[PDB]
Design an enzyme around this catalytic site. Structure first.
Site, mmCIF file in Angstrom:
data_model
loop_
_atom_site.group_PDB
_atom_site.id
_atom_site.type_symbol
_atom_site.label_atom_id
_atom_site.label_comp_id
_atom_site.label_asym_id
_atom_site.label_seq_id
_atom_site.Cartn_x
_atom_site.Cartn_y
_atom_site.Cartn_z
ATOM 1 N N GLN D 15 -3.279 9.523 -6.066
ATOM 2 C CA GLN D 15 -4.576 10.248 -6.329
ATOM 3 C C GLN D 15 -4.014 11.857 -4.933
ATOM 4 O O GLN D 15 -3.743 13.092 -5.529
ATOM 5 C CB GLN D 15 -5.381 10.129 -4.580
ATOM 6 C CG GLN D 15 -6.145 9.136 -5.397
ATOM 7 C CD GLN D 15 -7.751 8.624 -4.954
ATOM 8 O OE1 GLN D 15 -9.420 8.561 -5.415
ATOM 9 N NE2 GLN D 15 -7.779 9.029 -3.504
ATOM 10 N N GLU D 71 -5.582 -1.478 -10.461
ATOM 11 C CA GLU D 71 -7.008 -1.589 -10.403
ATOM 12 C C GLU D 71 -6.832 -0.543 -11.118
ATOM 13 O O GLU D 71 -6.126 0.729 -10.742
ATOM 14 C CB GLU D 71 -7.881 -1.703 -9.498
ATOM 15 C CG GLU D 71 -8.995 -0.844 -9.356
ATOM 16 C CD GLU D 71 -8.892 0.305 -9.355
ATOM 17 O OE1 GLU D 71 -8.789 0.034 -7.886
ATOM 18 O OE2 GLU D 71 -9.292 1.479 -9.203
ATOM 19 N N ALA D 99 -5.020 -5.761 -5.077
ATOM 20 C CA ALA D 99 -4.176 -6.833 -4.458
ATOM 21 C C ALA D 99 -4.524 -6.950 -3.194
ATOM 22 O O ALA D 99 -5.002 -7.942 -2.233
ATOM 23 C CB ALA D 99 -2.803 -5.940 -4.060
ATOM 24 N N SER D 140 0.427 4.564 0.315
ATOM 25 C CA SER D 140 -0.095 4.044 1.655
ATOM 26 C C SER D 140 0.612 2.555 1.881
ATOM 27 O O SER D 140 1.190 1.830 0.964
ATOM 28 C CB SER D 140 -1.495 3.861 1.031
ATOM 29 O OG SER D 140 -1.734 2.545 0.761
ATOM 30 N N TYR D 224 -10.767 12.640 1.039
ATOM 31 C CA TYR D 224 -9.503 12.219 0.592
ATOM 32 C C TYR D 224 -8.796 13.740 0.264
ATOM 33 O O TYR D 224 -7.514 14.056 0.048
ATOM 34 C CB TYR D 224 -9.358 11.375 -0.146
ATOM 35 C CG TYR D 224 -9.072 9.772 0.085
ATOM 36 C CD1 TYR D 224 -8.810 9.652 1.693
ATOM 37 C CD2 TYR D 224 -10.259 8.704 -0.515
ATOM 38 C CE1 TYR D 224 -8.856 8.320 2.473
ATOM 39 C CE2 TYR D 224 -10.355 7.383 0.565
ATOM 40 C CZ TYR D 224 -9.235 7.789 1.825
ATOM 41 O OH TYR D 224 -8.810 6.822 2.019
ATOM 42 N N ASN D 228 -5.568 15.372 0.653
ATOM 43 C CA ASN D 228 -5.230 15.164 -0.005
ATOM 44 C C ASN D 228 -3.952 16.639 -1.029
ATOM 45 O O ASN D 228 -2.715 17.337 -1.220
ATOM 46 C CB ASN D 228 -4.780 14.208 -1.661
ATOM 47 C CG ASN D 228 -5.645 13.230 -0.767
ATOM 48 O OD1 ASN D 228 -4.490 12.845 -0.358
ATOM 49 N ND2 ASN D 228 -6.179 11.917 -2.041
ATOM 50 N N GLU D 254 22.228 14.800 0.167
ATOM 51 C CA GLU D 254 21.393 16.065 0.659
ATOM 52 C C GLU D 254 20.426 16.066 1.646
ATOM 53 O O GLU D 254 20.911 16.176 2.606
ATOM 54 C CB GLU D 254 21.648 17.491 -0.211
ATOM 55 C CG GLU D 254 21.695 18.466 1.018
ATOM 56 C CD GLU D 254 21.982 19.667 0.231
ATOM 57 O OE1 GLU D 254 22.147 20.233 -0.918
ATOM 58 O OE2 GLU D 254 22.256 20.838 0.801
HETATM 59 N N1 LIG Z 1 -4.059 10.386 2.612
HETATM 60 C C1 LIG Z 1 -4.444 9.450 1.273
HETATM 61 N N2 LIG Z 1 -4.926 8.647 1.993
HETATM 62 C C2 LIG Z 1 -5.936 7.465 1.335
HETATM 63 C C3 LIG Z 1 -6.252 8.105 -0.013
HETATM 64 N N3 LIG Z 1 -7.052 6.808 -0.549
HETATM 65 C C4 LIG Z 1 -6.171 5.500 0.566
HETATM 66 N N4 LIG Z 1 -5.460 6.272 1.580
HETATM 67 C C5 LIG Z 1 -5.526 5.391 2.509
HETATM 68 O O1 LIG Z 1 -4.788 3.825 1.693
HETATM 69 C C6 LIG Z 1 -4.843 2.769 2.252
HETATM 70 C C7 LIG Z 1 -5.247 1.474 2.204
HETATM 71 O O2 LIG Z 1 -4.861 1.314 0.946
HETATM 72 P P1 LIG Z 1 -4.664 1.865 -0.905
HETATM 73 O O3 LIG Z 1 -3.958 3.112 -0.988
HETATM 74 O O4 LIG Z 1 -6.186 2.810 -0.910
HETATM 75 O O5 LIG Z 1 -5.035 0.979 -1.016
HETATM 76 P P2 LIG Z 1 -3.915 0.298 -2.410
HETATM 77 O O6 LIG Z 1 -2.750 0.836 -2.519
HETATM 78 O O7 LIG Z 1 -5.041 0.843 -4.264
HETATM 79 O O8 LIG Z 1 -4.116 -0.850 -2.379
HETATM 80 P P3 LIG Z 1 -5.197 -2.090 -2.711
HETATM 81 O O9 LIG Z 1 -5.299 -3.339 -1.451
HETATM 82 O O10 LIG Z 1 -5.264 -3.188 -4.677
HETATM 83 O O11 LIG Z 1 -6.817 -1.351 -3.182
HETATM 84 C C8 LIG Z 1 -6.166 3.257 3.720
HETATM 85 O O12 LIG Z 1 -5.716 3.170 5.138
HETATM 86 C C9 LIG Z 1 -6.839 4.683 3.765
HETATM 87 O O13 LIG Z 1 -7.102 5.345 4.372
HETATM 88 C C10 LIG Z 1 -5.878 8.935 -0.106
HETATM 89 O O14 LIG Z 1 -6.326 9.338 -1.496
HETATM 90 N N5 LIG Z 1 -5.641 9.990 0.887
HETATM 91 MG MG LIG Z 2 -7.071 0.663 -5.059
#
Ligand SMILES: Nc1nc2c(ncn2[C@@H]2O[C@H](COP(=O)(O)OP(=O)(O)OP(=O)(O)O)[C@@H](O)[C@H]2O)c(=O)[nH]1
Ligand SMILES: [Mg+2]
Ligand SMILES: CC[C@]1(O)C[C@@H]2CN(CCc3c([nH]c4ccccc34)[C@@](C(=O)OC)(c3cc4c(cc3OC)N(C)[C@H]3[C@@](O)(C(=O)OC)[C@H](OC(C)=O)[C@]5(CC)C=CCN6CC[C@]43[C@@H]65)C2)C1
Ligand SMILES: Nc1ncnc2c1ncn2[C@@H]1O[C@H](COP(=O)(O)OP(=O)(O)CP(=O)(O)O)[C@@H](O)[C@H]1O
Ligand SMILES: Nc1nc2c(ncn2[C@@H]2O[C@H](COP(=O)(O)OP(=O)(O)O)[C@@H](O)[C@H]2O)c(=O)[nH]1
Ligand SMILES: [Ca+2]
Ligand SMILES: [Ca+2]
Ligand SMILES: [Ca+2]
Ligand SMILES: [Mg+2]
Ligand SMILES: [Mg+2]
EC number: 3.6.5.-
Lengths: 341, 54, 429, 437
Positions: D15, D71, D99, D140, D224, D228, D254
């Site tokens: 995202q 997913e 996961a 993340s 989000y 974002n 660099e």
């Molecule tokens: N800044 C920002 N943080 C996000 C966003 N989506 C999820 N997060 C953060 O990411 C963390 C959760 O991880 P995700 O990236 O949603 O999970 P994933 O990587 O899809 O892994 P799964 O467990 O398989 O769903 C939490 O701390 C959320 O606040 C986003 O679109 N923007």
């Molecule tokens: Mg996920």
């Protein structure tokens, strides 16, 4: 209902502040490792400042200023006064000091250059060596004996050979002032100070009459409690002595310099420790220790970051902490002199 | 206070300002850790299916 | 797609299960014939979690109805939404279970279990990516308790990598007077400790107290009790049926709520507590928040203030200030931080769904993993021991082939479960 | 011209990557269908923007990007989004089940079944590259995919591209928007296994972005999408030197040279100013000195910490808009006498400065106002270790009771990897304290 934690059991000042907060019925004490507090009465060493201000929905306040150790350590204070342009090396109210590292580990050569100028100039050349790892203090005129004692970090400063001596007794003393800096960096001076006096006559030619510490005056000193109770002279008695013996006042002859030194020290470090635009707020109680010479000049000795109070003044000072530093951030349902700046 | 290495172009410019002078595992080792973990899963599932058979 | 397969067993399981499908069909705009008649695309975005799509755009509940007697399932088929279930998903016997766990688990139920697993297999094969199963049943009877826990064990054998979730109704002498229900429940709890990932403890003791004391229902019926169960089941599955970020599938819920594998028994809660046919005054966010944490709103007769919360999930439904929800949720944790374990940081999670339930402008659902649930298991254990110390009524079970040692082991496991909750209640950081 | 490949892992990475590539297209004037009218060399070329976009014979500019999520519902938004024509389906990789917020599930169990497909799709983009610099990895810390699969992918990238640079954009967990209790576990597990494979990593604390959105954009409950769009502005400022003509941070190497003297200490603190609400009908345009001084205010940092109580190892100022070197040198001089800026003894107290005359581009209809000048400061300060200490303490509280550990052991992970990861983090905190205290 406000919440607070206690992470220093040996703090006699904040043990009473804790007792006062619970007695209001609007403060609840949590476990020491509960992160959902409004107020932290933190520990002296390694306070986890990095963990404060990260609780959603909680305004958090701590009773210590991160970085205030620069003012409350022997070697740190000297380096601060020498290297800060606001204070400068030409600072008149701080005795000429030098930071000396032991040879097994600096300003040794600079300490000797100004030392020989006193021997050549027929001037009083008596110095004192001390450190923040004390109860170990040496007062000598020969620099060869001072440098040998440090190797056995210390600082060497000029010993005030001509101190103001109270009568009757011909005895030394020092002044302790309690200063409270709130979250807005307002500087508040507690109206009541104490004179930790010596009970032995000053002999300008033994370290009982020279060191005015409350523990040393209760141990090595034989006349403990003779002239005043616990060797603690308060401001009312000292103001009367200055009026009867010197025809001056405490406010005019001493306190103006004290308030000036307090402002100069705390304003110097304000950009480095202020919590104004920070995610958590700080306040802190400081203990300033001053010396007065025979010409009624005030000298700064050191600053204590975790000071203890006098028995008579515990109730009033700790209550003022709650009113000015705690309840100002967390309102419920003046004993200080504000040093404007 | 010295500006050095001023580079310029049409979309901007860059420079450096100096205020004071100064005073991996292989693919074989990766697969061995992945398969050792998959081995622990299959062992745990096997002990479950043994337990359920009892 | 992440499909859930629903199974309802025995009388209580089929009656509560039927009300669940009736309630969520209305929430998703499905009529008794399986046709969508809603006015929102959010109703259909995750419709496949619980429904299969058929010819003519028909939505069929992915539900399997199981009983050892045909009585309740005849009542379901003739019920309001009885025509929506797949007819081949009605698996029923004729003998009954006689409120006997041994009959459901070892004799009568063994004869019927294979035909149930065939329907399960057929449903699980047409799933893009099955996440797991949910079972509704009571623990005090024979079919839901005995055959239900047999089904769980056999389903786990065939699908050992899938989540098993149950809505399990605990018996109470305030509601039923069959003397062997503490035996049936204790034998079942032992099964649930080992073979489920999440169990919602639906305590008939608490449902009675809510209906009798709070709703002033002086002649409570099971329809009164099941009204609370329906609202709660809708609330705890909202995160599965609608778009959202928190606990969107069964496994993510389990990872958030279950810190130790055996302590997976949740106390549900709901606000506002309402009877059937009763809502003029809308509830405010502070009211929802205080009520959902009130002991009187818990669907398990356990005092939350007698234990500590390991993990909490909170689901708010309706159009409201998500800012104010955050403020009120933070206030509870900050004003009652003693009842939350400090060695699990940020153990309270909150979700908000804009679609409210039927007949309510806004509602809140509570899901707590609290050590106070040991009070429920202590209550059953004391009723169990009072009889078992004299082997009273045991012949009903030894007559089906069971040994007394199997009762001793179930009793020991449940007392071990109580000890495990007690050790994490006293642990400290 | 040397190409860069962006890899977006998990929901957060995908995202944020979607917001970045949307902003990249607005900055370079690339239409939603991939057509760039200002590009005169149809079907090829070696301009500076070609480091991020490839070209087809029909004139379509295609991001050098791969999206991976275990997913499919998040990447499906890209497949039907506004910029769906930019990407071809080979770049969008999805599994069936995620996961479940479990590092071990994303790294060992589910990662092993898709790691070979991801590397193959990456290799297809690499084959179109005449001189690949390396990779920019968006993920993340807290998710199972963002933590677990990323660390697996980084280990394989170091094997298959041992000489290429790898930079991270990492979302640090914040309880105000987090969706899992075990996110401290996942963060420390992935940091331990990725540390030796990352050259430079820009951490973004969701707490800092959330409060900046509330404070400066007047958003009561940021989404989000709110977070974002702001993150994409910071990422755009950081990558602008790779996509435009210039001489500062012109290649990935660099970044490490200018910001990372010690390899393990490769987490620069990012600070951005100004962030102005578009709801204001008029706002006083801040000067070069005002936006530069704001770079030393904690409320503008991507991670809340106090750089006054640490030491700097490097500091870069990246300006966009109406900025001239004269006003920058004056602001730095004023700030040096008013702020507590301490460098390590083995480093010069200096600032590398880059200016891009093009003012910051904002998304039409977004929350950010158009400004005439903006700056992003990239400083490698030891104060960022406060974020490691916060993370390690939450880890310690839960691991002392082994809470949730069975979810990881059950996926094939050994309990010893927990303590091994934590000891590595304890060594990281020790390194920071030696350099900064
Ligand atoms: N800044 C920002 N943080 C996000 C966003 N989506 C999820 N997060 C953060 O990411 C963390 C959760 O991880 P995700 O990236 O949603 O999970 P994933 O990587 O899809 O892994 P799964 O467990 O398989 O769903 C939490 O701390 C959320 O606040 C986003 O679109 N923007
Ligand atoms: Mg996920
Ligand atoms: C929700 C399902 C439910 O309807 C709940 C109760 C009982 N059953 C069956 C219906 C029923 C009830 N009472 C009946 C009397 C005769 C025939 C049938 C009934 C029911 C009710 O509506 O009361 C007006 C009820 C029953 C009980 C009931 C409450 C109740 O509804 C108010 N109890 C709390 C017990 C009971 O044992 C008890 O402890 O009361 C303090 C209670 O004892 C006394 C002195 O009243 C009593 C009354 C018949 C006595 C023997 C054992 N059983 C077990 C449950 C208990 C009951 C309500 C199922
Ligand atoms: N330069 C100096 N000139 C004169 N007297 C001095 C001096 N330095 C120290 N002293 C004397 O030594 C005493 C103790 O010094 P110091 O304050 O360093 O010990 P200390 O810091 O451990 C006690 P506290 O923590 O309460 O200040 C002072 O009260 C003063 O009488
Ligand atoms: N809440 C609720 N409890 C029920 C219902 N029907 C039965 N029970 C309870 O279930 C237990 C009896 O089990 P039951 O389901 O009837 O036996 P089974 O058909 O053999 O599974 C008793 O504790 C009853 O109080 C119901 O519709 N709702
Ligand atoms: Ca038969
Ligand atoms: Ca071209
Ligand atoms: Ca490498
Ligand atoms: Mg001292
Ligand atoms: Mg019955």
């Amino acid at each position: 209902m406000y919440t607070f934690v206690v992470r220093d059991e040996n703090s006699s000042v904040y043990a009473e502040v804790s007792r006062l907060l619970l007695a209001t019925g609007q403060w609840k004490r949590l476990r020491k490792d509960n992160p959902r507090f409004n107020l932290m009465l933190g520990e002296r060493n390694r306070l986890p400042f990095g963990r404060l201000g990260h609780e959603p929905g909680l305004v958090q306040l701590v009773n210590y200023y991160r970085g205030a150790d620069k003012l409350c350590r022997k070697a740190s204070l000297v380096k601060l006064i020498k290297t800060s342009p606001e204070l400068s090396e030409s600072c008149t109210w701080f005795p000429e000091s030098y930071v000396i590292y032991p040879t097994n580990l600096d300003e040794r050569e600079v300490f000797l250059a100004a030392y020989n100028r006193r021997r050549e100039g027929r001037e009083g050349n008596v110095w004192i060596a001390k450190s923040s790892a004390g109860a170990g203090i040496l007062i000598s005129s020969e620099a060869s004996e001072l440098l040998d004692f440090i190797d056995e970090v210390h600082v060497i400063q000029k010993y005030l050979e001509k101190p103001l001596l109270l009568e009757p007794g011909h005895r030394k003393f020092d002044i302790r002032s309690w200063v409270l800096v709130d979250h807005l960096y307002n500087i508040y001076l507690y109206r009541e100070g104490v004179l930790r006096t010596s009970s032995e006559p000053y002999n300008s030619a033994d370290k009982t009459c020279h060191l005015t510490n409350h523990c040393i005056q209760k141990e090595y000193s034989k006349n403990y409690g003779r002239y005043e109770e616990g060797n603690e002279m308060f401001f009312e008695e000292f103001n009367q002595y200055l009026m009867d013996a010197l025809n001056t006042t405490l406010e005019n002859s001493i306190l103006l310099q004290i308030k000036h030194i307090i402002r100069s020290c705390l304003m110097c470090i304000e950009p480095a420790i202020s919590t104004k635009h920070l995610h958590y707020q700080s306040f802190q109680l400081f203990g300033f220790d001053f010396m007065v010479d025979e010409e009624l000049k005030v000298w700064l000795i050191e600053v204590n970051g975790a000071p203890a109070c006098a028995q008579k003044l515990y109730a009033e000072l700790c209550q003022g902490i709650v009113d000015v530093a705690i309840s100002s951030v967390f309102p419920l349902a003046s004993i200080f002199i504000k040093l404007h700046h | 206070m010295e500006v050095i290495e001023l580079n310029k172009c049409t979309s901007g410019q860059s420079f450096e300002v100096i205020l004071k002078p100064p005073s991996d595992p292989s693919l074989e080792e990766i697969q061995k850790k992945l398969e050792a973990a998959e081995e622990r899963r299959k062992y745990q599932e096997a002990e479950l299916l043994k337990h359920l058979a009892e | 797609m992440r499909e859930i397969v629903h199974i309802q067993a025995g009388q209580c399981g089929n009656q509560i299960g039927a009300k669940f499908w009736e309630v969520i069909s209305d929430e998703h705009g499905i009529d008794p014939t399986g046709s969508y008649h809603g006015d929102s695309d959010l109703q259909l975005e995750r419709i496949n979690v619980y429904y299969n799509e058929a010819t003519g755009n028909k939505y069929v509940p992915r539900a399997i109805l199981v009983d050892l007697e045909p009585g309740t399932m005849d009542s379901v088929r003739s019920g309001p939404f009885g025509q929506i279930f797949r007819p081949d998903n009605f698996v029923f016997g004729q003998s009954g279970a006689g409120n006997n766990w041994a009959k459901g688990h070892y004799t009568e139920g063994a004869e019927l279990v294979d035909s149930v697993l065939d329907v399960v297999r057929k449903e699980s094969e047409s799933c893009d990516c099955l996440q797991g199963f949910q079972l509704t049943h009571s623990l005090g009877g024979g079919t839901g308790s005995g055959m239900g826990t047999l089904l769980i064990s056999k389903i786990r054998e065939e699908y050992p990598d899938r989540i098993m979730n149950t809505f399990s109704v605990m018996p109470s002498p305030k509601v039923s007077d069959t003397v062997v229900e503490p035996y049936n429940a204790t034998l079942s709890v032992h099964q649930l400790v080992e073979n489920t990932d999440e169990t919602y403890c639906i305590d008939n003791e608490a449902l009675y107290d809510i209906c009798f004391r709070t709703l002033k229902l002086t002649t409570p019926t099971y329809g009164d009790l099941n009204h609370l169960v329906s609202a709660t089941m809708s609330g705890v599955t909202t995160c599965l049926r609608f778009p959202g970020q928190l606990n969107a599938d069964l496994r993510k819920l389990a990872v958030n709520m279950v810190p130790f594998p055996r302590l997976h028994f949740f106390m549900p809660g709901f606000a506002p507590l309402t009877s059937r046919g009763s809502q003029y005054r809308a509830l405010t966010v502070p009211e929802l928040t205080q009520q959902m944490f009130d002991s009187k709103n818990m669907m398990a007769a356990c005092d939350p203030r007698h234990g500590r919360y390991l993990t909490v999930a909170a689901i708010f439904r309706g159009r409201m200030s998500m800012k104010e929800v955050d403020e009120q949720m933070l206030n509870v944790q900050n004003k009652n931080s003693s009842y939350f374990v400090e060695w699990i940081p940020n153990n309270v999670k909150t979700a908000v769904c804009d679609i409210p339930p039927r007949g309510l402008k806004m509602s809140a659902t509570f899901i707590g993993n609290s050590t106070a649930i040991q009070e429920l298991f202590k209550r059953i254990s004391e009723q169990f021991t009072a009889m078992f110390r004299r082997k009273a009524f045991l012949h009903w079970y030894t007559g089906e082939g069971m040994d007394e040692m199997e009762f001793t082991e179930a009793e020991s496991n449940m007392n071990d479960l109580v000890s495990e909750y007690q050790q994490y209640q006293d642990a400290t950081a | 011209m040397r190409e860069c490949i962006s890899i977006h892992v998990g929901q957060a990475g995908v995202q944020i990557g979607n917001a970045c590539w949307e902003l990249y297209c607005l900055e370079h004037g690339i239409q939603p269908d991939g057509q760039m009218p200002s590009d005169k060399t149809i079907g090829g070329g070696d301009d500076s923007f070609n480091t991020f976009f490839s070209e087809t014979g029909a004139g379509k500019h295609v991001p050098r990007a791969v999206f991976v999520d275990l997913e499919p519902t998040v990447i499906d938004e890209v497949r039907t989004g506004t910029y769906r024509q930019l990407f071809h389906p080979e770049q969008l990789i999805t599994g069936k089940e995620d996961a479940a917020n479990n590092y071990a599930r994303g790294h060992y169990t589910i990662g092993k079944e898709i790691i070979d497909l991801v590397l193959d799709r990456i290799r297809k983009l690499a084959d179109q590259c005449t001189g690949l610099q390396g990779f920019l990895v968006f993920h993340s810390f807290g998710g199972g995919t963002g933590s677990g699969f990323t660390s697996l992918l980084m280990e394989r990238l170091s094997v298959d591209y041992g000489k290429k640079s790898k930079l991270e954009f990492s979302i640090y967990p914040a309880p105000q928007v987090s969706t899992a209790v075990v996110e401290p576990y996942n963060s420390i597990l992935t940091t331990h296994t990725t540390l030796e494979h990352s050259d430079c990593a820009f951490m973004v604390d969701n707490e800092a972005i959330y409060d900046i959105c509330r404070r400066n954009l007047d958003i009561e409950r940021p989404t989000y999408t709110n977070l974002n769009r702001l993150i994409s502005q910071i990422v755009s400022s950081i990558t602008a030197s790779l996509r435009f003509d210039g001489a500062l941070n012109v290649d990935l190497t660099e970044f490490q040279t200018n910001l990372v003297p010690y390899p393990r200490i490769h987490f620069p603190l990012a600070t951005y100013a100004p962030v102005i609400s578009a709801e204001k009908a008029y706002h006083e345009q801040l000067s070069v000195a005002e936006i530069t001084n704001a770079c030393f205010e904690p409320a503008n940092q991507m991670v809340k910490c106090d750089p006054r109580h640490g030491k700097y190892m490097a500091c870069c100022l990246l300006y966009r808009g109406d900025v001239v070197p004269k006003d920058v040198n004056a602001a730095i001089a004023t700030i040096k006498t008013k702020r507590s800026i301490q460098f390590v003894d083995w480093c010069p107290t200096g600032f590398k400065v880059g200016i891009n005359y093009q003012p910051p581009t904002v998304v039409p209809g977004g929350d950010l106002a158009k400004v005439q000048r903006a700056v992003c400061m990239l400083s490698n300060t030891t104060a960022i270790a406060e974020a490691w200490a916060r993370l390690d303490h939450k880890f310690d509280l839960m691991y002392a009771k082994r809470a949730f550990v069975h979810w990881y052991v059950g996926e094939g992970m050994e309990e010893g990897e927990f303590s091994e990861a934590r000891e590595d983090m304890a060594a990281l905190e020790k390194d920071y304290e030696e350099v900064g205290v």
